[PDB]
Amino acid sequence: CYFPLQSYGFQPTYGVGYQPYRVVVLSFELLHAPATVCGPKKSTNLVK
Amino acid sequence: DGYFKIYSKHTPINLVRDLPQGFSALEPLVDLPIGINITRFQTLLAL
Numbered sequence: 391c392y393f394p395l396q397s398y399g400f401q402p403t404y405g406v407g408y409q410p411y412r413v414v415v416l417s418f419e420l421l422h423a424p425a426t427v428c429g430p431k432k433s434t435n436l437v438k
Numbered sequence: 439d440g441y442f443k444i445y446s447k448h449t450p451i452n453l454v455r456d457l458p459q460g461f462s463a464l465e466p467l468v469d470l471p472i473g474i475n476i477t478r479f480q481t482l483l484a485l
Protein backbone atom coordinates (compact mmCIF):
# COMPACT_ATOMS: atom_id res chain seq x y z
CA CYS A 391 0.00 0.00 0.00
CA TYR A 392 1.18 3.57 -0.86
CA PHE A 393 -0.43 7.01 -0.76
CA PRO A 394 -0.31 7.89 -4.54
CA LEU A 395 0.98 11.50 -4.00
CA GLN A 396 4.04 13.14 -2.41
CA SER A 397 4.64 16.75 -1.31
CA TYR A 398 7.65 18.64 -2.42
CA GLY A 399 9.42 20.39 0.41
CA PHE A 400 11.08 23.47 -1.07
CA GLN A 401 13.43 25.22 1.37
CA PRO A 402 15.42 28.20 -0.06
CA THR A 403 18.83 26.50 0.51
CA TYR A 404 18.40 23.71 -2.15
CA GLY A 405 20.69 23.39 -5.21
CA VAL A 406 19.76 24.73 -8.68
CA GLY A 407 17.22 22.35 -10.28
CA TYR A 408 16.06 21.05 -6.85
CA GLN A 409 14.42 24.54 -6.57
CA PRO A 410 10.69 25.30 -7.29
CA TYR A 411 9.96 26.45 -10.79
CA ARG A 412 6.59 27.80 -11.97
CA VAL A 413 5.50 26.55 -15.39
CA VAL A 414 2.81 27.71 -17.79
CA VAL A 415 1.90 26.10 -21.11
CA LEU A 416 -0.06 27.97 -23.77
CA SER A 417 -1.78 25.12 -25.59
CA PHE A 418 -3.99 26.33 -28.47
CA GLU A 419 -6.46 25.01 -31.07
CA LEU A 420 -6.79 25.85 -34.75
CA LEU A 421 -9.17 26.80 -37.55
CA HIS A 422 -12.23 24.46 -36.97
CA ALA A 423 -14.20 27.55 -35.72
CA PRO A 424 -13.71 31.37 -36.12
CA ALA A 425 -10.37 33.03 -35.24
CA THR A 426 -11.02 34.35 -31.73
CA VAL A 427 -7.57 35.14 -30.27
CA CYS A 428 -4.71 36.91 -31.99
CA GLY A 429 -2.00 39.50 -31.54
CA PRO A 430 -2.17 43.27 -31.93
CA LYS A 431 -2.22 44.23 -35.61
CA LYS A 432 0.69 46.71 -35.52
CA SER A 433 -0.18 50.10 -37.03
CA THR A 434 1.63 53.25 -38.25
CA ASN A 435 1.06 57.01 -38.49
CA LEU A 436 -1.43 58.25 -41.13
CA VAL A 437 -0.08 59.89 -44.35
CA LYS A 438 -2.02 61.65 -47.17
CA ASP B 439 -19.50 30.09 -41.06
CA GLY B 440 -19.89 30.26 -37.24
CA TYR B 441 -20.49 34.05 -37.23
CA PHE B 442 -23.88 35.01 -35.81
CA LYS B 443 -25.10 38.28 -37.35
CA ILE B 444 -27.85 40.52 -35.99
CA TYR B 445 -29.28 43.41 -38.03
CA SER B 446 -32.02 45.69 -36.58
CA LYS B 447 -34.27 48.78 -36.99
CA HIS B 448 -36.43 50.75 -34.51
CA THR B 449 -39.17 53.20 -35.62
CA PRO B 450 -42.16 55.02 -34.13
CA ILE B 451 -45.51 53.88 -35.60
CA ASN B 452 -49.20 54.86 -34.99
CA LEU B 453 -51.25 51.82 -36.15
CA VAL B 454 -53.83 49.33 -34.74
CA ARG B 455 -52.44 45.75 -35.36
CA ASP B 456 -50.90 44.83 -38.79
CA LEU B 457 -47.30 44.87 -40.11
CA PRO B 458 -47.07 48.30 -41.86
CA GLN B 459 -47.13 48.98 -45.60
CA GLY B 460 -44.00 51.12 -46.19
CA PHE B 461 -40.22 50.58 -46.75
CA SER B 462 -37.21 50.66 -44.39
CA ALA B 463 -33.87 48.77 -44.16
CA LEU B 464 -32.22 47.14 -41.12
CA GLU B 465 -28.73 48.41 -40.19
CA PRO B 466 -26.22 45.79 -38.84
CA LEU B 467 -26.46 45.65 -35.02
CA VAL B 468 -23.62 43.29 -34.00
CA ASP B 469 -21.66 40.26 -35.26
CA LEU B 470 -20.59 37.48 -32.82
CA PRO B 471 -17.80 34.87 -33.56
CA ILE B 472 -19.82 32.07 -31.91
CA GLY B 473 -19.15 28.89 -33.97
CA ILE B 474 -22.26 26.81 -33.02
CA ASN B 475 -24.93 25.07 -35.12
CA ILE B 476 -28.46 26.54 -34.78
CA THR B 477 -31.55 24.68 -36.07
CA ARG B 478 -34.26 25.91 -33.65
CA PHE B 479 -35.03 29.19 -31.84
CA GLN B 480 -37.39 30.43 -29.10
CA THR B 481 -38.57 33.87 -27.86
CA LEU B 482 -38.48 35.39 -24.35
CA LEU B 483 -41.45 37.48 -23.11
CA ALA B 484 -42.41 39.51 -20.01
CA LEU B 485 -45.17 38.15 -17.66
Ligand SMILES: *[C@@H]1O[C@H](CO)[C@@H](O)[C@H](O)[C@H]1NC(C)=O
Nearest residue numbers: 422423440472473474475476
Ligand atom coordinates in the same frame (compact mmCIF):
# COMPACT_ATOMS: atom_id res chain seq x y z
C1 LIG C 1 -22.49 21.15 -36.83
O1 LIG C 1 -23.05 20.16 -37.75
C2 LIG C 1 -22.07 19.43 -38.60
C3 LIG C 1 -22.81 18.38 -39.42
O2 LIG C 1 -23.46 17.44 -38.53
C4 LIG C 1 -20.96 18.82 -37.72
O3 LIG C 1 -19.88 18.31 -38.53
C5 LIG C 1 -20.35 19.88 -36.81
O4 LIG C 1 -19.30 19.28 -36.02
C6 LIG C 1 -21.45 20.48 -35.91
N1 LIG C 1 -20.85 21.45 -34.99
C7 LIG C 1 -20.79 21.27 -33.67
C8 LIG C 1 -20.09 22.38 -32.87
O5 LIG C 1 -21.25 20.27 -33.13
